[model samples]
Target: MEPHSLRYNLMVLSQDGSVQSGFLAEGHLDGQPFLRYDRQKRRAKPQGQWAEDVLGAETWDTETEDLTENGQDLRRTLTHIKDQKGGLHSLQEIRVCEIHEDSSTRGSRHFYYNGELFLSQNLETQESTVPQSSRAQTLAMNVTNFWKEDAMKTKTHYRAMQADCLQKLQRYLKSGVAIRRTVPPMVNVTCSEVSEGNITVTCRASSFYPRNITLTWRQDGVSLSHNTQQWGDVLPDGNGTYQTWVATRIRQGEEQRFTCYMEHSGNHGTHPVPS
Candidate 1:
């Protein structure tokens, strides 16, 4: 096998184990569908779509104006609708944002990805076409592309973090009591718009030991909202240790901030806390 093909195979095996067999694609393959292993389901599914020129003949600009200034030039939005394929029957949307800027030869290109994961049944199964004003046309195109790019970036980041967490967990396993009781590390803080003008703040923490943790909302060093908190049970890490997470959602205006603090025991606790 070629070096690149061998490298890809080994990478997949490293994550999914050595019991799987698959073929590799080489060279400028266009519009070819590939199987993606769903780690959550422990199986492979057809998960992506490819196209050479997916936009077809749509043009966004007029004769006198250049699309480079508009930021909506030469874009491709590719989505794969996998119904009931994974654990949930949901819609996974992937949008690719690209702009074409003219140069001496062909042009320069840029790419962005945006995606959304939601219940698939909620989507309307029909395509709609309406006559467009220039502003409306530009707005629609920009909205779709920008959302697609943003969603794609988020999905990419999430996968990276998930991988990192798994690696950390594996190391903790070999280190014995070095990690002590497994503590859930994934934490979330959400700031909502309703609390923007209100003095009372609301915060929610997920899988947290409510009694042992502190949730505070402050503005410029002043407390604004009376605190309400709750706790969740810790789950077994399968090796005598436990893991759990805390989630904090604060209803505050655009300017307010909240912080979630937790105290736990670990090998490092033998020393003074680092400044």
Candidate 2:
């Protein structure tokens, strides 16, 4: 009953945009088995291929073929719909999502136009957002049923694959094989002189994953309390990495005694900066 396997997402933009501007179809998790169905590129690449060449894998061929066929049909249908609404030239954005859920949960398929919800359905109940016309209602029901049937078949295959992967992983664990863990953060500490004779100690942690981290300021080996610390939001670097900064005010000369401490699952310690 475990949830597994792929989801399809397709987006379309205005005609003036690049032919590949709005095309994307890939796994919901880790964006594997990706397919870009566009007037220009029309390419399909398996997961991890973006990081390494995996052109020799047999799974890549089957996945590409299946996704190309589906992507082509989906592109045509959506293009027709866009034309019926206002033509591809007037189109802004269109998005479609199909998800697979576990046995106890319901799957979902949704359609959006110009960032607004156009159609949505629950595959389990075949329920959907109220359709405005008979044709729309029929299309909703048909799509719901199609995804429901597809989920039933794919989930079965995914469950077997999951079990096999788990068995192999367990064997690796038993054999004491090393598995990769979360990457550690890069920590930096800097101090600046502010106008009010107060030094701002900034502690920045960058390129960290999992987002569970702590930054604390200390003076002369004592931790600073909430009243003495100011924290900034953790922000993404637009490339699957994150960074955050924390600052605390201290007297100019006391800056030498101030330290910034960071705690992450992968590593933890203090970073001291001289005044």
Worst 10 residues of 1 by lDDT: 1-10
Best-fitting candidate, measured by TM-score? Answer: 2
Instruction: Compute the lDDT of residue 26 as modeled in candidate 1.
Output: 15
Return the TM-score for each candidate structure.
0.20, 0.48
Q: Model 1 residue 261 lDDT?
A: 46
Q: What pairs collide in candidate 2? A: none
lDDT of 1 by residue, 1-275 (tens): 00000000101111121212221111111112322333344333333322112211121112012212111222212222221123322111221111112211111112222222221111112222323456435534654455456443233443342333233323323433122223433344443334444332223333422122333444444433553443344554344334443333443343334434434431111111111
lDDT of each: 0.28, 0.53
Candidate 2: segments with Cα more than 4 A from true spot = 1-7, 11-43, 46-49, 54-62, 65-108, 112-116, 121-186, 194-198, 206-214, 219-227, 235-243, 251-258, 263-265
Which runs in model 1 stand beyond 4 Å of their true positions? Answer: 1-184, 191-227, 230-254, 266-275
